[PDB]
């Protein structure tokens, strides 16, 4: 309580991902501890502060400029002549996401592709499409908030008893425009070939890389990137376009995260009361080539979202400080 | 412990200069107090930082 002597035991709703079992009484009403508390600290997420991305424009000072290459075929690094000098960059919406880019400027004219070293499979293959598609990860059922005062002015926003049937949050993708964008990409993916490719899923590792993690009103939505690799545009693209897939798929939710692998004073995402619906465009991708693949037979690509910086330089390849 | 209510007794090695026997009782009797705690607070010296000259 706000009083030092008075305490109170009160109940709320929590997730299984947010805690881990201890005191391994293998199964009799086992206790749990927060995953981040045992390793690091924790604080409130300041719910009045939002978490959505606004278009940010990075302006240069006097004595400097921003040279832009308006050529649509211009790749990441190289020479360019169609110059445009600017003082502030285009408004970039820093969508904090992994293995995917959302609400970004499209590489019109042709799907743009980049990579550090094409011979090295470990390097990230950046992609930037030329047509958007609506990806909707959604929690329809409402949330609840309860302000429990912990101290003299300190209060925690716990998740109260939810009203109605608590249906699981899930996610949706439209397969028609997605398969069209895949047709465009696999038309673009021919570096030296005409028809051979394989698409598999991630190899496993960190939870953020294993799925498509992003933000939705503070709630860290880890929506599953499993409906991506279920396609074979090997020989006939029309053969892969004929199976439409109105992909209804699972999407998990999390409250806490270590931003940029900062295992410190983490933040608990607060209640978001009302229906949650993250519908977003698609602008590009960050894939990776498998090491266990032949040289010329077939290159296996799979989503990779390790380096967050790759998600931000997708549109900065046009601009450069000069 | 890491949790609020959970506590535990653990042992270590310490010097005599760090503390002083609490003279409120008869003798020490395994009862000591930090010399600097009663005057002010105390925090660690960030052991990853050393104190060598440059």
């Amino acid at each position: 309580t706000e009083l030092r002597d008075k305490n109170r035991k009160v109940y709320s709703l929590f997730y299984k991902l947010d805690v881990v079992q201890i005191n391994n009484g293998n199964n009799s009403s086992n206790l749990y501890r927060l995953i981040n508390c045992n390793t690091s600290a924790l604080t409130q997420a300041c719910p009045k502060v939002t978490f959505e991305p606004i278009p940010i424009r990075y302006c240069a000072p006097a004595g400097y400029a921003i040279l832009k290459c308006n050529d649509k075929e211009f790749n990441g690094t190289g020479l360019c002549k169609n110059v445009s000098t600017v003082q502030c960059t285009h408004g970039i919406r820093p969508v904090v996401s992994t293995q995917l880019l959302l609400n970004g400027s499209l590489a019109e004219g042709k799907v743009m592709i980049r990579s550090e070293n094409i011979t090295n499979n470990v390097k990230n293959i950046i992609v930037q499409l030329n047509e958007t598609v609506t990806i909707n990860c959604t929690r329809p059922n409402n949330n609840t908030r309860k302000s429990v005062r912990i101290g003299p002015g300190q209060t925690f926003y716990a998740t109260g008893d939810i009203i109605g049937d608590i249906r699981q949050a899930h996610c949706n993708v439209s397969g028609s425009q997605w398969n069209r964008a895949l047709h465009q990409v696999v038309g673009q993916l021919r570096e030296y070939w005409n028809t051979t490719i394989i698409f598999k899923n991630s190899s496993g590792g960190d939870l953020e890389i294993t799925t498509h993690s992003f933000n939705c009103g503070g709630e860290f939505f880890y929506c599953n990137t499993s409906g991506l690799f279920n396609s074979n545009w090997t020989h006939n693209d029309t053969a892969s376009m004929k199976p439409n897939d109105t992909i209804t798929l699972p999407c998990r939710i999390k409250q806490i995260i270590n931003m940029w692998q900062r295992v410190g004073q983490a933040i608990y995402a607060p209640p978001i009361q009302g229906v949650i619906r993250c519908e977003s465009n698609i602008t590009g991708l960050i894939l990776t080539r498998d090491g266990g693949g032949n040289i010329n037979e077939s290159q296996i690509f799979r989503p990779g979202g390790g380096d967050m910086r790759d998600n931000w330089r997708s549109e900065l390849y046009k601009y450069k400080v000069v | 412990t890491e949790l609020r209510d959970k506590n535990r007794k653990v042992y270590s090695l310490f010097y005599k200069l760090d503390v002083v026997q609490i003279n409120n009782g008869n003798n020490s009797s395994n009862l000591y107090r930090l010399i600097n705690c009663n005057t002010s607070a105390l925090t660690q010296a960030c052991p990853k930082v050393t104190f060598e000259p440059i």
Partner: antibody
Amino acid sequence: QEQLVESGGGVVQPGGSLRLSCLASGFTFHKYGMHWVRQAPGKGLEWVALISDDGMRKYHSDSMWGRVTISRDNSKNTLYLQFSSLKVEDTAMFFCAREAGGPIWHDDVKYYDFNDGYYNYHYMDVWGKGTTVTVSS
Amino acid sequence: QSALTQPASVSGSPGQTITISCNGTSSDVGGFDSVSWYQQSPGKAPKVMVFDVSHRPSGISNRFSGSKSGNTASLTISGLHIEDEGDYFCSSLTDRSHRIFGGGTKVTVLG
């Protein structure tokens, strides 16, 4: 749940020995100082032996002192009692009871031992199955 | 070595209050207040009914209470239930950290 099972007890004769093994499950037995108790025919409970969490010290009733030796095995999560110079008066069902939970409580605050040990010196909260021993000449 | 002495058996009506009282010594009862009371039903292992005499262990209702007077302990039970039947044994921790059990009292509901 936290379960204890005694075994090894059986019909024996005085002057020999016996090995009573008390297995445990459902908790971290590595620091639970157990209690060996006996109940004779037509008699009440009678404490036999007690061992600390680390096996450093141990306590035996002056009647049963010397005849029995208690030991622990944290790897097996087991307790053991080795008898010697058995007497006909030792006819009883032997039980293997736990100690007063893991920590010791005071003012709602719980204290564990050194290296986070599950120590106490209090009532026995949990009791085991129990095994019979019949010493007869 | 000498078990804590109490009557061999007592009985009481359904719902009638009663109070067992067992004797001891100052080395165990009067020297340290860690006096407990166990219960054993016919066909059941022992189970604790009192420890920390002015407080009770798990699975014990407010009907059961404990008190101590010098070298003696007492177990009061108001509102005798059907589960109260069985042999009660008071025990105390000695100054040598050893435990000692009581003689026993077979409580049974009248009827």
